[PDB]
Structure formats: C-alpha cells, structure tokens
C-alpha cells in the first residue's frame, strides 16, 4: 500500500542524498588530482625538452624529431586513457567506501577513518606505477603504428583517426584494470578489512558494467581528441605539422576548466548511473 511506498521512498531519498554528497566530494577529488596527473605525464613524456634542443642548432636533428613523433602521440593518447581511468576509478572507490560509510550508520564498525584513509590512498597506483606501465605500453603501440611513417607523409583527418584506432586496438588487446590497481599478492585487524575492500574494487574493475562505462568514456575522449584537431585541417597535413597539434592536446584533455573533457565526464549521466549502482550495492545490508 501507501506505507510500503513511503518506506521505499524514504530509503531511496536517503541513499540519494548521500550518493549526491559523495559525487560532490568525488568531483572535487578528481579536479584537485588533475594537475598531478598532468605533471606526471609531462615529466615522463617531455616533448618540451626535445623542442628546446631543436630550437638550439643540434646534430641528429632527425633522431629528435622521430622521438617527438612518438612522445607527442603517446602523451595525448595516454592523456585520454588516464583521465577516463581517473574519473571512473574515483567513482568506484568513493561509492564503495561511501557504501560502507552509509551502512556503519546502523556494534562493529566496518570502515573507520583509518580504513577509509588506507583504502583511498590506493589511488596512488594509477598516478604512479600504473601510469608508467600504461606509458610503456602505449609508447610501444605508437612506435608500431607511426614508426615507419615519414614526417613528410601527408595525413587527412580520416587517416589520423585511423592511426588512433590502430593505436587503441594494440593497447586494449595487449584488461585495463591492471593499470588502476596493483596486482593482488598470494594481518592487522583493520588491514584485513582494507584487503577485503581492495579485492572488491579489483572485482568491480573487472565487471562488465565497469568495462562498459570505461569504454563509453574512452570513446568520447578520443572523438573529442579528434574534434579538437579538426580545426587545424582547413585537406591533409604533413605528419610533422600534425605532431605539434597532437602534442598540445594534453593541455585541453587534462584541463580542470569547465566545458573541457574532464567536466563532461563528471556531468555525464551514464557514469552517474553506474556510480549510483555501485553505491547501492555497497550500502545495502
């Protein structure tokens, strides 16, 4: 009757206030971490140093340019992957822990402040060892796709999309969850609970629903990479002219600013639906 309907209404309403609050937190955490992701990519894929050498009358000028060919494409390709992973991994973690935090409002507390801290600190991996492994793999893939391609080779916008698809296919069949968490290995009483949480996160990253939502974001991130570059094709350009167009994409793919790619992921209703389902699974007794 109406009593049951009121009961389900209040439960949903309660779940929804905490979920929404938790999305606001997650949105903040994503945007505060972006400059660190951006800094790590620039340091590990430093185009601007190679450029500096070229603007300084060097020998092996073509070795530097071939290096730039790889670094530029690698950096923009990795910028898209890591940004999408950043957003979706934080949605997972914050709604997994949010779920537990929601339930502890009912003797034994499952997720106290120290478990929350040690669990959330696992984001480390994506910005750390995971990112470097990701760079190594994308760099190899770019090296296979663009290695034998001349700097004079003129590429149309369609050719460039096709190179990007080839890079993607080498990467995504080399899952992507290996880059977001450290491997599980073959204790302290709240380290037990932390291990249970990291395992549940790993399982989630291997779920079809998670893989679906990450694929959506990736698709939209690479279309955007291409839309951004379309403005420079007004026709085909020499690959050497494409390098600096591609090289500069990191600044927009990893911008905190509104209307940029990260904010479109944060306001993308498909990722919210996925996050809401995570929170619900982990907040129900």
């Amino acid at each position: 009757g109406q009593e049951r309907e009121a009961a389900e209404y209040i439960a949903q309403a309660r779940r929804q206030y905490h979920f929404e609050s938790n999305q606001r937190t997650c949105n903040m955490t994503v945007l505060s971490m972006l400059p660190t992701l951006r800094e790590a990519l620039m340091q590990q894929l430093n185009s601007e140093s190679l450029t500096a050498l070229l603007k300084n009358r060097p020998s092996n000028k073509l070795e530097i340019w071939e290096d730039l060919k790889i670094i530029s494409f690698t950096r923009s390709t990795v910028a898209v992957y890591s940004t999408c992973m950043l957003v979706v991994l934080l949605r997972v973690q914050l709604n997994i822990i949010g779920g537990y935090i929601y339930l502890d409002n009912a003797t034994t507390i499952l997720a106290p402040p120290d478990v929350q801290q040690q669990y959330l600190s696992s984001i480390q991996h994506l910005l750390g060892d995971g990112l470097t492994e990701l760079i190594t793999v994308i760099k190899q893939a770019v090296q296979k796709v663009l290695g034998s391609v001349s700097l004079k080779h003129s590429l149309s916008l369609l050719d460039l999309e096709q190179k990007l698809k080839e890079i993607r296919n080498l990467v995504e069949q080399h899952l992507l969850s290996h880059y977001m968490m450290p491997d599980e290995e073959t204790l302290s009483p709240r380290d037990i609970t932390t291990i249970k949480l990291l395992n549940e996160t790993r399982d989630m990253l291997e779920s079809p629903d998670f893989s679906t939502v990450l694929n959506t974001c990736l698709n939209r991130g690479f279309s955007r990479l291409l839309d951004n570059m379309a403005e420079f094709f007004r026709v085909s350009l020499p690959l050497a002219k494409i390098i600096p167009i591609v090289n500069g994409q990191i600044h927009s793919v990893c911008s905190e600013t509104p209307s940029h790619f990260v904010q479109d992921l944060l306001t993308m209703e498909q990722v919210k639906d996925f996050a809401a389902n995570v929170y619900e699974a982990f907040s129900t007794p």
């Binding site: 450029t51 070229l54 603007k55 000028k61 340019w65 700097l151 004079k152 020499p238 050497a240 002219k241 390098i243 600096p244 167009i245 090289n247 500069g248």
Partner: peptide
C-alpha cells in the same frame, strides 16, 4: 640535402607556438 624536409621542419617548429 633535402630542402623540402628542411622547410617542413623549420615551419612545424614554429607550430609549437
């Protein structure tokens, strides 16, 4: 001794601007 390449590389170096 590749003029066309040297032109191409000089002008593309300005495109990082």
């Amino acid at each position: 001794a590749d003029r066309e390449l040297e032109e191409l590389l000089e002008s593309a170096l300005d495109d990082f601007d």
